[PDB]
Design an enzyme around this catalytic site. Structure first.
Site, short mmCIF file in Angstrom:
data_model
loop_
_atom_site.label_atom_id
_atom_site.label_comp_id
_atom_site.label_asym_id
_atom_site.label_seq_id
_atom_site.Cartn_x
_atom_site.Cartn_y
_atom_site.Cartn_z
N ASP A 1 0.80 -1.23 0.00
CA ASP A 1 0.00 0.00 0.00
C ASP A 1 0.83 1.28 0.00
O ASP A 1 1.33 1.72 1.05
CB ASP A 1 -0.92 -0.01 1.22
CG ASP A 1 -1.88 1.16 1.25
OD1 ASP A 1 -2.07 1.80 0.19
OD2 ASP A 1 -2.43 1.44 2.34
N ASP B 1 -1.53 5.48 -5.37
CA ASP B 1 -2.02 4.66 -4.26
C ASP B 1 -2.34 3.23 -4.70
O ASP B 1 -3.43 2.93 -5.17
CB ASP B 1 -3.24 5.35 -3.64
CG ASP B 1 -3.79 4.64 -2.41
OD1 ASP B 1 -3.24 3.57 -2.04
OD2 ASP B 1 -4.78 5.15 -1.82
C1 AA9 Z 1 -8.09 -2.84 -2.19
C2 AA9 Z 1 -9.44 -2.80 -1.50
N1 AA9 Z 1 -10.29 -1.88 -2.24
C3 AA9 Z 1 -10.26 -0.52 -1.83
C4 AA9 Z 1 -9.44 -0.01 -0.83
C5 AA9 Z 1 -9.50 1.34 -0.52
C6 AA9 Z 1 -8.64 1.89 0.54
O1 AA9 Z 1 -9.11 2.66 1.36
N2 AA9 Z 1 -7.34 1.47 0.53
C7 AA9 Z 1 -6.46 1.74 1.64
C8 AA9 Z 1 -5.77 0.45 2.05
C9 AA9 Z 1 -6.72 -0.71 2.18
C10 AA9 Z 1 -6.47 -1.89 1.49
C11 AA9 Z 1 -7.34 -2.96 1.59
C12 AA9 Z 1 -8.46 -2.85 2.37
C13 AA9 Z 1 -8.72 -1.68 3.05
C14 AA9 Z 1 -7.86 -0.60 2.96
C15 AA9 Z 1 -5.50 2.87 1.27
O2 AA9 Z 1 -4.51 3.08 2.28
C16 AA9 Z 1 -6.19 4.22 1.12
N3 AA9 Z 1 -5.17 5.23 0.80
C17 AA9 Z 1 -5.55 6.61 1.16
C18 AA9 Z 1 -6.66 7.12 0.26
C19 AA9 Z 1 -5.93 6.71 2.62
O3 AA9 Z 1 -7.09 6.71 3.02
N4 AA9 Z 1 -4.84 6.82 3.45
C20 AA9 Z 1 -5.06 6.82 4.90
C21 AA9 Z 1 -4.02 5.94 5.55
C22 AA9 Z 1 -4.12 5.93 7.06
C23 AA9 Z 1 -3.86 7.35 7.54
C24 AA9 Z 1 -4.91 8.28 6.97
C25 AA9 Z 1 -4.94 8.24 5.44
C26 AA9 Z 1 -10.38 2.19 -1.16
C27 AA9 Z 1 -11.20 1.67 -2.14
N5 AA9 Z 1 -12.11 2.56 -2.79
C28 AA9 Z 1 -13.04 3.25 -1.94
C29 AA9 Z 1 -14.03 2.54 -1.30
C30 AA9 Z 1 -14.91 3.22 -0.48
C31 AA9 Z 1 -14.80 4.59 -0.33
C32 AA9 Z 1 -13.80 5.29 -0.98
C33 AA9 Z 1 -12.91 4.61 -1.78
S1 AA9 Z 1 -12.45 2.55 -4.44
C34 AA9 Z 1 -13.86 1.48 -4.59
O4 AA9 Z 1 -12.86 3.89 -4.82
O5 AA9 Z 1 -11.31 1.93 -5.09
C35 AA9 Z 1 -11.14 0.34 -2.48
#
Ligand code: AA9
Length: 371
Positions: free
Chosen positions: A32, A214
């Site tokens: 990530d 990302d």
């Molecule tokens: C890979 C799983 N699908 C997915 C994941 C994420 C997501 O939030 N990814 C984070 C890591 C992760 C991986 C697997 C399962 C859960 C989470 C990323 O770290 C996010 N990076 C940035 C944007 C972030 O939020 N950083 C944080 C890190 C911690 C400190 C504060 C900042 C977002 C969306 N998508 C989604 C889904 C719902 C709502 C919005 C986006 S999508 C469908 O648009 O691709 C889809």
């Protein structure tokens, strides 16, 4: 030995095998670039096949501090500690690193994903609880001779190359865009085109309020204004067929009889990235094979079915996995830049190919950074 060390898909993340503790406990860890915490399931959960057992590791050290991390999707809480960490199919080194032992979570772990933890590869500035918690890659670089760079080829499978660039993983030239600020891997988009037609917005809108690279997010996510304009242009290009509103919002699938997906009705999307010289840029071009994400389901398998993998954001542009797929992406931390090249696993059909090309010059001297 590092080539093909990733497994997974855009929808559920790509992961690398790691070990934690002494003796070593094997876990699959999602890679990530959109976060900066290294964390692992450390208690039973319905979707975890296995988890980190701290009591079995003689090298574990409790830091006596809790941590909470919320993502755009999912959240978890856990206990901070340090332990020894290795990457069997990476550099042959062992490092002592911070690890968050996840004890509770909500909508974080994904059923059947095959991963049990997450490797935040971004900078300390976005680490939780704060920037004093050294991220894994920083520890790796400090403790070993490894050069301060890694690259990702996301293809499923792909490769994470730590410490260097593997020329067998790309073709043509590497084009570099500056890392604007070392927190996220923040970059600047200067122009967007859909089938060669400019969206004609003030370029700051493309980076409202930041743009990031990302690997942990599936979709290309765009600021509302940009998203709305992009969809209008894609609808227009594809108007020979009409799809439900739910498709354009990512809430429902579009399906075609197996093998008959009409790729040629969907436009190419070009994102122009800021170059390393004033008012120069290069473009990366995205085919529909990238932004229409296949959804595998035996039940629907008389057809090929897809989700629209471009979606709206209120937190800036996110260049997620569907954008990274088919490019070789170099996170050149040492030179504060990100390189793009066409991947050895590029998308193309017989008519069109994804591309990384330049240079392009602009007359308008506006800074495209939002601030
Ligand atoms: C890979 C799983 N699908 C997915 C994941 C994420 C997501 O939030 N990814 C984070 C890591 C992760 C991986 C697997 C399962 C859960 C989470 C990323 O770290 C996010 N990076 C940035 C944007 C972030 O939020 N950083 C944080 C890190 C911690 C400190 C504060 C900042 C977002 C969306 N998508 C989604 C889904 C719902 C709502 C919005 C986006 S999508 C469908 O648009 O691709 C889809």
């Amino acid at each position: 030995e590092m080539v093909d060390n990733l497994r997974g898909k855009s929808g559920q993340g790509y992961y690398v095998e790691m070990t934690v503790g002494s003796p070593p406990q094997t876990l699959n860890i999602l890679v990530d670039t959109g976060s900066s915490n290294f964390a692992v399931g450390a208690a039973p959960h319905p979707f975890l096949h296995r988890y980190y057992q701290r009591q079995l590791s003689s090298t574990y050290r409790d830091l006596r501090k809790g941590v909470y991390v919320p993502y755009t999707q999912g959240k978890w809480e856990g206990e901070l500690g340090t332990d020894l960490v290795s990457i069997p199919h990476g550099p042959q080194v062992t490092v002592r690193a911070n690890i968050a032992a996840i004890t509770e979570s909500d909508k974080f772990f994904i059923q059947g994903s095959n991963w049990e933890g997450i490797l935040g590869l971004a900078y300390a500035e976005i680490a939780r609880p704060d920037d004093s918690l050294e991220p894994f890659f920083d520890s790796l670089v400090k403790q070993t001779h490894v050069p301060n760079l890694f690259s990702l080829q996301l293809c499923v499978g792909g490769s994470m190359i730590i410490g260097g660039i593997d020329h067998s993983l790309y073709t043509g030239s590497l084009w570099y865009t500056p890392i604007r600020r070392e927190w996220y891997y923040e970059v600047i988009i200067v122009r967007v085109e859909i089938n060669g037609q400019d969206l004609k917005m003030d370029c700051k809108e493309y980076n409202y309020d930041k743009s990031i690279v990302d690997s942990g997010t599936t979709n290309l996510r765009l600021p509302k204004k940009v998203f709305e304009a992009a969809v209008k242009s894609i609808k227009a290009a594809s108007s020979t067929e009409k799809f439900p509103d739910g498709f354009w919002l990512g809430e429902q699938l579009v399906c075609w009889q197996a093998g008959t997906t009409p790729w040629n009705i969907f436009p190419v999307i070009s994102l122009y990235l800021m170059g390393e010289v004033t008012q120069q840029s290069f473009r990366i071009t995205i085919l529909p094979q990238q932004y229409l994400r296949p959804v595998e389901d035996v039940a629907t398998s008389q057809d090929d079915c897809y989700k629209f993998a471009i979606s709206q954001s209120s937190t800036g542009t996110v260049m997620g996995a569907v954008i990274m797929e088919g490019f070789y992406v170099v996170f050149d931390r040492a030179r504060k830049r990100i390189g793009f090249a066409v991947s050895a696993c590029h998308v193309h059909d017989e008519f069109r190919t994804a591309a990384v090309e330049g240079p392009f010059v602009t007359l308008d001297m506006e800074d495209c950074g939002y601030n």
